[PDB]
């Protein structure tokens, strides 16, 4: 038994709390159920580290069994890592594709053992046939990067993938084209959209979760104003449930032109460079409350409403 892969076994016991510790070990389904009730879960947490390391010794766990526990820990806890999206393109002259899971698991294994000599590859098959892939990057000498993994989410038929941000950016063209060859595609396009919720990023892209339908003394004088500022938000956003996106970086290189000032930047031909980031949770139903508040105009700009439509948040704006 190697010590450095046994350090990762006692690390993931320390990274789970005790309320959901019975959720992970029943879905890990490698230990029998008589040994789970033998280990007392109501004791001190360092005794849970000592009791589970005797169970991993006598059952002879491996580097794929310890990485099987890392997928189930990151399935119920999807909040710690961000998810960038990849867009694969279908080539010309193609009508149907040939996909097989036994043809996918060997072609992705041989494409990573050929390029680098220490790549740990572990697979797990989930509901509606989604493959969950861990890649541990080793460079030329060491046993690979166990503390900082890299996750690829692939739903076995889509050309869209959900890959997490690795801390080694030099292997990111290597990870992208290795998914392209094994899934029978010819072009990989890194699409610029990222968030911390994986369940909301599959709702805004796949668009299957967004729509679920089948006294006269307090009188206002603003009859033409009151239902005008909410009729734009009902025909675009509505009261329907929306996916969550918390970040949008707006790179502006626009100019300044207005009819109020005639001496403020009236001779400038140089562009005014800017970058505008939004850092607030649930932004798609946060901007809909500004229009009945009266602090925003009822002709709302289309840059804030094309965010579930045009399927990115990084925008580049040109204006005179």
């Amino acid at each position: 038994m190697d010590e450095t892969v046994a350090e990762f076994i006692k690390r993931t016991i320390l990274k789970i709390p005790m309320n959901e510790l019975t959720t992970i070990l029943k879905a890990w389904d490698f230990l029998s159920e008589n040994q789970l009730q033998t280990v007392n879960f109501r004791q001190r947490k360092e005794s849970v580290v000592q009791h589970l390391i005797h169970l991993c010794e006598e059952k002879r766990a491996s580097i794929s069994d310890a990485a099987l526990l890392d997928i189930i820990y990151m399935q119920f806890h999807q909040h710690q890592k961000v998810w960038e999206v990849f867009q694969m393109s279908k080539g010309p002259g193609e009508d149907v594709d040939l996909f097989d899971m036994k043809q996918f698991k060997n072609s992705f294994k041989k494409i990573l053992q050929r390029a680098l000599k220490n790549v740990t590859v572990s697979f797990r098959e989930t509901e509606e046939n989604a493959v969950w892939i861990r890649i541990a990057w080793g460079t030329q000498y060491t046993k690979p990067n166990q503390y900082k993994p890299t996750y690829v989410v692939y739903y076995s038929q889509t050309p869209y993938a959900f890959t997490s941000s690795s801390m080694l950016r030099r292997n990111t063209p290597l990870l992208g084209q290795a998914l392209t060859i094994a899934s029978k595609h010819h072009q990989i396009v890194k699409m610029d959209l990222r968030s911390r919720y994986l369940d909301s990023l599959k709702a805004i892209v796949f668009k299957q979760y967004n729509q679920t339908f089948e006294d006269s003394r307090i009188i206002h004088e603003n009859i033409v104003e009151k239902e005008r500022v909410q009729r734009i938000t009902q025909e675009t956003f509505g009261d329907y449930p929306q996916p969550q996106l918390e970040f949008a970086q707006y790179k502006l290189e626009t100019k300044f032109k207005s009819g109020l000032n005639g001496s403020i930047l009236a001779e400038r031909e140089e562009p005014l460079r800017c970058l505008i980031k939004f850092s607030s949770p649930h932004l798609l139903e946060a901007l809909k409350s500004l229009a009945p508040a009266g602090i925003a105009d009822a002709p709302l700009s289309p840059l804030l409403t094309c965010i579930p439509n045009k399927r990115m948040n990084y925008f580049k704006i040109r204006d005179k």
């Binding site: 700009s301 289309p302 840059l303 045009k310 925008f315 580049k316 704006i317 040109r318 204006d319």
Partner: peptide, 4 residues
Amino acid sequence: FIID
């Protein structure tokens, strides 16, 4: 307002 075009997006390049």
